[PDB]
Amino acid sequence: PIPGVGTYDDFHTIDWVREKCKDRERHRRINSKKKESAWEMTKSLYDAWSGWLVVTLTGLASGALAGLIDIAADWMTDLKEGICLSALWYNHEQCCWGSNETTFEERDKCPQWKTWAELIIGQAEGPGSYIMNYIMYIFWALSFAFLAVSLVKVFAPYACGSGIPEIKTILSGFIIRGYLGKWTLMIKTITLVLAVASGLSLGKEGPLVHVACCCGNIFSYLFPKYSTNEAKKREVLSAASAAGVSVAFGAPIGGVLFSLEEVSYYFPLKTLWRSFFAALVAAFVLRSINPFLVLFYVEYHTPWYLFELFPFILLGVFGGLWGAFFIRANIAWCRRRKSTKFGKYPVLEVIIVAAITAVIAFPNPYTRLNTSELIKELFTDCGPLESSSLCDYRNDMNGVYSAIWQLCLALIFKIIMTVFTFGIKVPSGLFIPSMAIGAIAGRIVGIAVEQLAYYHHDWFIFKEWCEVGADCITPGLYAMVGAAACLGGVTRMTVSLVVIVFELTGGLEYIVPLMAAVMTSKWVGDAFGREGIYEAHIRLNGYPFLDAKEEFTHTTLAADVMRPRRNDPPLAVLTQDNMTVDDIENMINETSYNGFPVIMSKESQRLVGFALRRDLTIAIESARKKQEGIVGSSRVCFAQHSPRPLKLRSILDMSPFTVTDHTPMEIVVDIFRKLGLRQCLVTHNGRLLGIITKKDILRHMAQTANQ
Amino acid sequence: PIPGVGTYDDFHTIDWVREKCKDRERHRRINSKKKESAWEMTKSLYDAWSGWLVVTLTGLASGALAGLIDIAADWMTDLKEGICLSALWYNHEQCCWGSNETTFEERDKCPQWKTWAELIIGQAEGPGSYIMNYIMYIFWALSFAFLAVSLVKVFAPYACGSGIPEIKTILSGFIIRGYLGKWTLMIKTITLVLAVASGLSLGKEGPLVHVACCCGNIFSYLFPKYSTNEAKKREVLSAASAAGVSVAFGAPIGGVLFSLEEVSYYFPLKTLWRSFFAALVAAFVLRSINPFLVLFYVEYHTPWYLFELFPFILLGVFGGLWGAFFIRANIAWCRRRKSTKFGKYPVLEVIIVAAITAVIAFPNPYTRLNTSELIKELFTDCGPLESSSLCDYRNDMNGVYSAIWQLCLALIFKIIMTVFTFGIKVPSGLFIPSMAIGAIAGRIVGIAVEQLAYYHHDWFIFKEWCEVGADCITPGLYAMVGAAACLGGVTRMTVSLVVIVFELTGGLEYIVPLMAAVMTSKWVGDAFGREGIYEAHIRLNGYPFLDAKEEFTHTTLAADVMRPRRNDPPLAVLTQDNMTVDDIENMINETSYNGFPVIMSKESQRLVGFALRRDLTIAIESARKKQEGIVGSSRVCFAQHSPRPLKLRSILDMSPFTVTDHTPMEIVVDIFRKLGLRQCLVTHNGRLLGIITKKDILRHMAQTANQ
Amino acid sequence: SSEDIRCKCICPPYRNISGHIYNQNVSQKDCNCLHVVEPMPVPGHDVEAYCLLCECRYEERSTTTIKVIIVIYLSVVGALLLYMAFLMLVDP
Amino acid sequence: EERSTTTIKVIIVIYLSVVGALLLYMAFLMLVDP
Ligand SMILES: CC(C)CCC[C@@H](C)[C@H]1CC[C@H]2[C@@H]3CC=C4C[C@@H](O)CC[C@]4(C)[C@H]3CC[C@]12C
Ligand SMILES: CC(C)CCC[C@@H](C)[C@H]1CC[C@H]2[C@@H]3CC=C4C[C@@H](O)CC[C@]4(C)[C@H]3CC[C@]12C
Ligand SMILES: CC(C)CCC[C@@H](C)[C@H]1CC[C@H]2[C@@H]3CC=C4C[C@@H](O)CC[C@]4(C)[C@H]3CC[C@]12C
Ligand SMILES: CC(C)CCC[C@@H](C)[C@H]1CC[C@H]2[C@@H]3CC=C4C[C@@H](O)CC[C@]4(C)[C@H]3CC[C@]12C
Ligand SMILES: [Cl-]
Ligand SMILES: [Cl-]
Ligand SMILES: [Cl-]
Ligand SMILES: [Cl-]
């Protein structure tokens, strides 16, 4: 065919049926030539292994990038507190790892590491030392935020954000050229570390999915099958997202579940195993580099009890109530950024947000501590070896009020900051902030329950379930349940989230509580709205996304959504014969229609086919270059084989999808969702009356929702 | 509408689009009636929770039945070895549960337990005692097999077999009335225990899926939403299969993965969380009853090494090489059963197979032991505390040849016996036999590797990976890898299998080796055929099952598959008006068509819709009963509103799916698979030219495969 | 119930003495090698090493659950067989 | 406990080098490119 036929414009949804037909044709062509020569057999073998090779490459790259990002972020975050003079290249834990001056009270207390007060003021302790450390922490946070936002703006504007919403749109057939490019990959990889170092209320776990998707696209350019076909590319991208989640949480099964449930519109059976393999490879690479087998490993000696479900369910409710609130709050704020002029200054917004975050975080130890580190500390169970402040009260009696007050302040600060930090023009992830919020809430609830059990063991439930004077209540389990509940409420992920949490903490004994809390949070959030944060952001950005949840009224019929309607002029059509190249070019230029239907005769209105406008113009130009005398006067014949008329039947679709006007629009939407139709043709009495397009369907659904 | 309209005959596929429209209409009615009264609101609330209630009931029933079946099977299997006079309800382990006469050499040795020889001969040791034990073992196996097959034949013929193939076909849309009924549930529950106790080369894990599906089908009747609609019932059945796998292997995540991968043709996002919840509930129940948290828990202190992948890959290959063989062997045997007279005597076949199995198994220790117990013994890691025979050689030097020879004999016995055992008229499972075969092979391979390492530590690989004189090699890991490889080769499941194995073992450190082995086994099996054992059985049974793998030739067109063709007379059509009730009834009786296309006029041949034969006859009979004077003379008008003509427009489908003759048959098959269409009306120039049916597509594909 | 509860200490071979299992009924805290093992075949100074090599566990079984499950399964099987006999002989 | 010094070596050094190169390219674009 003509070069460039079958391609797509930027910001245009693909036709899955056409891509599948192209893939089948390519498979037939490559298979036919296998017997021709041995080199053809080798090429066919390479093509057959293209999926395995591409998923392996994507997994390896994702694992390496995740490890690099994790270590770089840890080092940069510890940069704020101070510098290890003996080794400018190490973080606090690494600098004090081998120090023999370490004390039980302070594990990370070593002479080699020097805080900025020691560097400049010269005294580790004192009001001047505290002020100097405060100022340097704020300055470093602002510097990291400025670098991240400037790098995003200058090189890869797409690098900002989690990327899960745009990935969801892309995997549904949408095209955003440059989103998964090399520039975006590099800029996002650097800016993720920079942003996590800045201390902003964001995470790097979610954006690693976008990083993996970028790697998958870049590797797919290597293999002809995936470069040529968009649907196969999107399958590779689904595998890449699975690998990204795997590296993010060390949960290959959780990553596969997330890919299946959240980001993958169409999930073939083979893609399941391919994604699992990619996730396993990426997790192996991360385990090979990053350690120096479970990130949030938890050791709760006492098994969870049935009554303990009631607090967990309560946490679930909170997980919903916050979640929906965030979905109602953040979106609004984001919308304001689009409507008002405070969004006109992304760098300034990032800088002010970072300043506020650092200023309010330094006073409170939990806020100052890295969000992932805070989640880890919350998950850890109290023990005699532990010297954590959270457990101090337990040592005192067995100040609880002071610890709970600090935890509540950190919870409020994180809740307020996550609203204004998500959506800014730097790579930000909601997974870690939601996990920290839920973990703080669960820690508070578990402390309260343990206090109730200890003070009031006379209660029959506590006495029967727990022995008197026994620490049956384990706050770490409550923190895990709260984190899972908050994440489920904000994202509405049910199975993938539970499996991800289980893999992240390596606890199969707490699956039931996690599922109960996640279900409670999901139901509570759905009570205030079923759309999740990612889908809400998709709708906010106005991407062409269609979801199974959306549905039409029973009264709506295919005639209602037809493009021609009444006011609009009749849809442009092409005659099968007696049409000049000039006429087709004029029709292409005049209208922005994605494609034009071609009928045998204008009076007959009998559909012959459907030719995409891009394909029409590409074919016309290529034929003009190839064959002389095509000055626009020569006619174009779409029928099967001096003027030397141009033949555009090849670009034509011989069997375009057709529906009837009296067909209800529910069936039309079902067909569009299942088969991924770009457009369908509404015909009455065997003649073309109108055309329904995916864009018209989304327009009607958006109009119904907006009413 | 007329009562009985929309119902489906036995051995017929359901139209998923029509079921979706029915569900939407019912939802509209229920939601509309909510404001009418508070009782209507309560009914709507019950409808909304109907899915959660039905999945909860299915999970509870599945857990209870699985626990009861497991305990009864254990007791009845140990009945063959002997009886516990002090307690006729304890198996060998329970009867020696607390005895103080036990010895380190013999764990299950107590005076309380008494072998049949000591019951009847009075001597525990001696040639006569051994002969008596042999005879009683054979007699008990024969009695159990006879009882199982007699119950299957007398009451529930469907109880035979695993049921996974039929579950697949049903979830695809196929209907088998009585397969998931109460009679089948009870008979299968009893017969699974009977067959497992008989000692035949079969398992109860796979059949638990069918048991759970039966429970779900029975519970669906309680809730009108799932009882009225077939697609909703099939979603509930998918959740039930997930719960069944969960109870079978204690793998709720693995159960959901299996449900998506293998049995469920369509898996809506909601069904994912519903299935996970059902599986968790069933597993919780099983833990509540059956224990008295991992069934096949293994403890390999030494982590798996990279070089060990090479043996594992080898095991993988073996898996596939076995799997393919079984698929080519068993099916052939099964085919012979359908072709020759030995299938006319099911009970005799079961008796003979059970006798052969017992006779050849009693002499060898591994074969005599229960298959699940043998798998557990193979999986366990050898240690000084353990007194297993397999590890005796390790104790002696560190006889190996004797243990290896016995293991190979057991492997051969199981491999040859599984071919004949599968397909007989009793509940049989392939999971446990495949696990045992693969575990024996992996144990042999691991013993060989350990012997090579110990004898030859000078090898650079062994010396570098393993310390000299150290038991780095863990044969239990090799046995697990072999079991996974064999199961992947026979079933061809990739991710669900790996997750199920990991859950059944409880170790996430061996997921990479297991995945590699499963990949190798699946690739090797596909080299000899891409169809799994369950799919092969589906094809052998001739069920109307359409798979995504199956595809038509490029040359094939919708015209080729059109029903009228040339030799066949024109397909029957119903005139919109001026056609008598007698004429419709005569057409219904004359032809066995699933439905007739209704055209406006015979000459026009303009399609007005599609009227199902069942709906047509039901409506005609109901109208005759309701309204007097309908003796068949009155005309029938399908058009929208003395003779009092019958109105059959309601039953008729206003917008039947239509395709063009020139459309490639690949597109038609894709549409059928994605939308679950029962039939599509091929029309040319806006007039009816023929009909393609899922039966026609299946027939064409079957002929293509048979060529 | 005593039958429902027990605790066992498994001792692998140590010097002259071979492996030995000591199974008695005791509470969880009373489940220990010194209490479970009485006397110890090994000498006093090596008794501690013998205990270290010894692995002890405390187990509980719901014998009543097995009771009920077996009883109900047997009752169902008997009823089904009686109905089969009814159909084969009496029904004619 | 054991740790790999060379992993941190490579990761930190290459990340810093890439960041510095990006900043230098940004400066070139802002000033030199005009
Ligand atoms: C084209 C792309 C996919 C290639 C990516 C290759 C990556 C994944 C490779 C390049 C260098 C590799 C590392 C090189 C050395 C070591 C040390 C060894 O003790 C464990 C593996 C480990 C840590 C490797 C892990 C994988 C690694 C990071
Ligand atoms: C944006 C990111 C990537 C930049 C990171 C650069 C960091 C590591 C640099 C910038 C300024 C540097 C400091 C500048 C001056 C000194 C004084 C010297 O006697 C010891 C090193 C020390 C204390 C440096 C440590 C490393 C340092 C903090
Ligand atoms: C209509 C169907 C779904 C109802 C099925 C209910 C089943 C699951 C119920 C009935 C009796 C129940 C058991 C009754 C008593 C006990 C003892 C307790 O220490 C643990 C739970 C356990 C073991 C219950 C498990 C669940 C159980 C088996
Ligand atoms: C098909 C299945 C369900 C039937 C199970 C019934 C079994 C358990 C029955 C059948 C025959 C029975 C035995 C028949 C005779 C005796 C002798 C008596 O002094 C002690 C009990 C003893 C030894 C019985 C034990 C239980 C027994 C083995
Ligand atoms: Cl994140
Ligand atoms: Cl995110
Ligand atoms: Cl089985
Ligand atoms: Cl099976």
Backbone angles phi, psi at C59, to 5 degrees: -125, 145
How many angstroms separate the most distant Cα atoms in chain C?
A: 81
Q: How is A644-666 classified by DSSP, letter by letter? A: --EE-TTTSBSS--EEETTSBHH
A164-203 residues touching D, CB cutoff 8 A: 186-187, 190, 193-194
The Cα B479–Cα B446 span in angstroms is: 7
Percent helix, strand, coil in chain D, to 5, is: 80, 0, 20
Please state, in angstroms and rounded to a whole number, the distance separating the CA atoms of residues B272 and B277: 9
Q: Which residues of B touch C23 (CB under 8 A)?
A: 98-100, 102
Helices and strands, number each (H, E), in chain B: 30, 11
Residue position matching structure tokens 């359901």: B14
Report the C-alpha gap between B382 and B447 in whole angstroms: 11
Displacement of CA B6 from its chain's centroid (Å): 28
For residues A432, A361, A186, A273, the Cα torsion angle rounded to the nearest 10 degrees is -10
> C57: which residues sit within 8 A by CB, 6+ positions away?
C7, C8, C31
CB B86 within 8 A of CB B236: no
B285 Cβ inside 6 Å of ligand 3:
yes
> Any bridge partners for residue C5, and if so which?
C60
Query: Token match 């198994």: residue?
Result: B361
**Strand order across the beta sheet in which A658-660 lies:** A658-660, A679-684, A687-693
Peptide bond into B564 cis (omega under 30): no
> Which chain A residue has its CA at the smallest distance from B518's CA?
A273
Quote the CA–CA distance of A393 and A443 in Å, as a whole number: 13
Q: Is the CB of A147 under 6 A from ligand 2?
A: yes
C20 membership: H or E segment, kind and range: strand C20-24
Residues of chain A with C-beta less than 8 angstroms from the C-beta of D13: 89
Burial (CB count <10 Å: 0-12, 13-18, 19+), residue A89: middle
Q: What is the number of the ligand closest to the CA of C62?
A: 3
Which conformational region is residue B630 in: left (phi greater than 0), alpha (psi within -120 to 50 degrees), or beta?
beta
Using the 8-state DSSP alphabet, how is residue A304 labeled?
A: P
Residues B187/B155, Cβ–Cβ less than 8 Å: yes
Half-sphere exposure in the Cβ direction for A329 (13 Å, CA)? 15
Structure tokens at B652: 């008729």
Residue among A68, A77, A83 to mutate when testing ligand 2 (max atoms within 8 A of CB) = A83
- Of B456, B513, B455, B451, which Cα lies nearest the Cα of B482? B513
Q: Can you tell me the distance from the alpha carbon of A268 to that of A278, in angstroms, rounded to the nearest whole number?
A: 15
| Cα–Cα dist A635/B153, whole Å | 75
Q: Give the resolution in Å.
A: 3.0
Q: Which of A276, A498, A519 sits opposite B495 (nearest CB)?
A: A276
Residue whose Cα lies nearest atom 23 of ligand 2: it is A83
Q: Give the closest residue to B500 by CA, choosing from B295, B302, B320.
A: B295
> If residue A614 lies in a helix (H) or strand (E), which one and from where to where?
helix A613-626
Distance CA A510, CA C38 (A): 40
Protein residue whose Cα sits closest to atom 9 of ligand 2: A88
- The C-alpha atoms of residue A576 and residue A589 are separated, in whole angstroms, by 19
Torsion sign, CA atoms A45, A48, A53, A54: positive
Residue of A60, A68, A69 with the most ligand 1 atoms within 8 Å of its CB, for mutation:
A60
Q: What is the largest CA-CA distance in chain A?
A: 104
Helices (H) and strands (E) in chain D, counts: 1, 0
In angstroms, the CA A543 to CA A546 distance is: 9
Q: Which helix (H) or strand (E) holds B416?
A: helix B400-421
3-class secondary-structure state, position A340: coil
Please tell me which of the candidates B260, B499, B675 has its beta carbon nearest to residue A674. B675
Distance from C-alpha of A197 to C-alpha of A550, rounded to nearest angstrom:
40
Contact B516, A281 (CB under 8 A): no
Residue A10 exposure: Cα atoms within 13 Å on the Cβ side? 4
Q: Do B498 and A276 contact (CB within 8 A), yes or no?
A: yes
Q: Which residues share a beta bridge with B683?
A: B688
Query: Which 3 state secondary structure label does DSSP give A139?
Result: helix
Amino acid at B274: R
In which residue are the tokens 């991240």 written?
A148
**Nearest alpha carbon, ligand 2 atom 6:** D16
**For atom 1 of ligand 4, which residue has the closest CA?**
B144
A596 DSSP assignment? E
Ligand 5 midpoint to CA A339 (Å): 27
CA–CA dist A485, A323 (Å, integer): 9
Q: Nearest-CA neighbor of A234 among A265, A261, A210?
A: A265
Residue closest to B30 by CA, chosen among B213, B216, B228: B228
Residue pair A354/A140 in contact by the 8 Å Cβ criterion: no
Report whether residue A619 contacts ligand 2, using a CB cutoff of 6 Å: no
Q: Identify the bridge partners of residue B691 per DSSP, sorted by sequence position.
A: B681
Cα maximum dimension of chain B: 104
Q: CA of B273, closest CA in chain A: separation in Å?
A: 6
Cα A372 to ligand 5 centre (Å): 9
Closest of A332, A261, A264, A248 to residue A537, by C-alpha: A332
Query: How would you write B456-475 as a 3-class SS string?
Result: CCCCHHHHHHCCCCCCCCCH
Interatomic CA distance for residues B283 and B15, integer angstroms: 34
Q: Distance between CA atoms of B411 and B439, rounded to whole angstroms?
A: 9
**Rounded-to-integer distance, Cα B650 and Cα B668, Å:** 27
Which helix (H) or strand (E) segment holds residue B581: the answer is: helix B581-590
Look at residues B490, B49, B495 and name the one whose alpha carbon lies nearest to residue B255: B495
How far is the C-alpha of B148 from the C-alpha of A235, rounded, in Å? 47
B534 C-alpha to ligand 7 centroid (Å): 13
Q: In the numeric block, which tokens belong to residue B119? A: 């019951």
Give me the residue from B68, B97, B147 closest to C6, CB to CB.
B97
User: Packing angle between helix A207-220 and helix A164-171, nearest 10 degrees?
Assistant: 40
CA distances, B355 to each of B202, B350, B424 (Å):
14, 8, 14
Taking alpha carbons only, the member of B667, B697, B661, B662 closest to residue B679 is B697
All residues at 6 or more sequence positions from A140 whose CB lies less than 8 Å from its CB, including other chains: A79, A80, A197
C-beta atoms surrounding B142 within 10 Å: 18
H helices within B100-221, ranges in order? 116-120, 127-154, 164-172, 182-198, 207-220
Method of elucidation: cryo-EM
Nearest CA to B66 out of B242, B212, B253 is that of: B212
Answer whether A364's CB lies under 8 Å from A389's CB.
no
Q: Which residues pair with B680 in a beta bridge?
A: B692
Structure tokens at A27: 């498979």
The beta-carbon neighbor of B515 closest among A276, A495, A683 is: A276
CA distance B432 to B429: 7
Question: Which residues of chain B are within 8 Å of residue C82 when distances are taken between CB atoms?
Answer: none
> In B615-686, where do the E strands start and end?
635-637, 646-647, 658-659, 679-684
Question: Quick one: which atom of ligand 1 is closest to the CA of A60?
Answer: 8
Which helix (H) or strand (E) is A544 found in, with range? Answer: none
Q: Which residues of B touch C53 (CB under 8 A)?
A: 384
CA distance B53 to B225: 12
Per the CB < 8 A criterion, the answer to whether A375 and A296 are in contact is yes
DSSP string, A86-102: T-TT--HHHHTTS-TT-
Q: Are A129 and A115 in contact (CB under 8 A)?
A: yes
The answer to whether B205 touches B244, Cβ cutoff 8 Å, is no
What is the Cα B37 distance to its own chain's centre?
Answer: 44
CA torsion angle B336 B340 B342 B344 (round to 10): 120
Handedness of CA A335, A341, A347, A353 (dihedral sign): negative
CA distance A18 to A231: 9
Rg of chain C (C-alpha set)? 24
In the sheet that holds B687-693, the strands lie side by side as B658-659, B679-684, B687-693
Paired tokens of B312: 């594992």
**Phi/psi at A552 (5° precision):** -100, 165
DSSP letter for B636, please.
Answer: E
B61 lines ligand 3 (CB under 6 A): yes
* Residues forming a β-bridge with A598: A574, A609
Q: Which amino acid is at D10?
A: V
Q: What is the DSSP string of B531-573?
A: --HHHHHHHHHT-----SS----SS-BHHHH-SS-SSSPPPP-
For residue A109, the tally of other CB atoms under 10 A from its CB is 15
DSSP string, B58-96: HHHHHHHHHHHHHHHHHHHHHHHHEEETT-TT--HHHHT
B661 neighbors B689 (Cβ within 8 angstroms): yes
Residue with tokens 């303990």: A308
| Residue pair A661/A689 in contact by the 8 Å Cβ criterion | yes
CA–CA gap between residue B306 and residue B300 (Å, rounded): 15
Whose tokens are 């090698």? That residue is C33
| Element housing A692 (H / E) | strand A687-693
Burial annotation B406-429 (CB, 10 A radius, 16+ → b, else e): bbebbbebbbebbbbbbbbbbbbb
Cα A190 to Cα A72: distance, rounded to the nearest angstrom:
9
- Cα(A136)–Cα(A588) distance, integer angstroms: 60
- Closest-CA residue, ligand 4 atom 13, reads B83
CA of B73 to the centre of ligand 3 (A): 20
d(CA A484, CA A436): 10
- Torsion angle of alpha carbons B330, B336, B341, B343, nearest 10°? 40
**How many C-beta atoms lie closer than 10 Å to residue B266's C-beta?**
16
Tell the burial category of A100 from Cβ atoms under 10 Å away from its Cβ (0-12, 13-18, 19+): exposed
The DSSP bridge partners found for residue B659 are B682
| Residues written for chain C | 92
**Which residue(s) pair with A274 in the sheet?**
none
Terminal-to-terminal C-alpha distance of chain A: 46
Residue B591, number of CB atoms within 10 A of its CB: 13
Q: Which two tokens stand for residue B169?
A: 């076909």
Closest ligand 1 atom to the C-alpha of A289? 23
C-beta of B60 in contact with ligand 3 (< 6 A): yes
From chain B residues 64-103, the ones with a CB under 8 A of any chain C CB are 67-68, 71-72, 75, 89-90, 94, 97-100, 102-103
User: Which atom belonging to ligand 1 lies closest to the Cα atom of A63?
Assistant: 8
Give a three-class secondary structure readout of A201-250. Answer: CCCCCCHHHHHHHHHHHHHHCCCHHHHHCHHHHHHHHHHHHHHHHHHHHC
Helices (H), A397-474: 400-421, 431-455, 460-465
